Amino acid sequence: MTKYKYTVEESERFNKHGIDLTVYGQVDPSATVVRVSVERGHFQEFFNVRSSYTYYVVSGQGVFYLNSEAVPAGATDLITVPPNTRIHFFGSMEMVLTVAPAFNEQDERHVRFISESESPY
Ligand SMILES: O=c1ccn([C@@H]2O[C@H](CO)[C@@H](O)[C@H]2O)c(=O)[nH]1
Numbered sequence: 001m002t003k004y005k006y007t008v009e010e011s012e013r014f015n016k017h018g019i020d021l022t023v024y025g026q027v028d029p030s031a032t033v034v035r036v037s038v039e040r041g042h043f044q045e046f047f048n049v050r051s052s053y054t055y056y057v058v059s060g061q062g063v064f065y066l067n068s069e070a071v072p073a074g075a076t077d078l079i080t081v082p083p084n085t086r087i088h089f090f091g092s093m094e095m096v097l098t099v100a101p102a103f104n105e106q107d108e109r110h111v112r113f114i115s116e117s118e119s120p121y
Pocket of ligand 1: 021
């Protein structure tokens with residue numbers, strides 16, 4: 001009766017600002033968990049007024065820019081970002097992303113686009 005398991009095969013997969021997102025389709029007000037694959041960067045800076053963003057780095061290496069501060073990231077690191085923090089990042093990484101409470105695009109604000117040449121990856 002209750003669906004507990006979600007697969008990649010049945011997920012929604014799309015590119016957003018240079019990252020490949022896997023959105024599984026589960027609904028839970030307390031948190032959203034998605035996969036993020038990135039080859040060079042997330043070429044847009046945004047913030048979320050409600051939700052914290054927590055990235056677990058499965059593999060690879062990159063750099064987060066959090067309110068313009070560089071934060072290097074590598075495999076097995078956890079990057080925790082409070083609400084109302086400007087975010088972008090560069091890197092070649094596979095990550096698991098938690099947005100808590102649940103992701104709502106109406107909570108997000110566009111700051112600026114980032115030139116693809118700005119990524120050193
Ligand atoms: O469920 C989610 C979680 C994050 N993002 C997007 O992922 C990027 C940051 O990893 C941002 O563009 C953010 O809007 C989504 O589209 N959906």
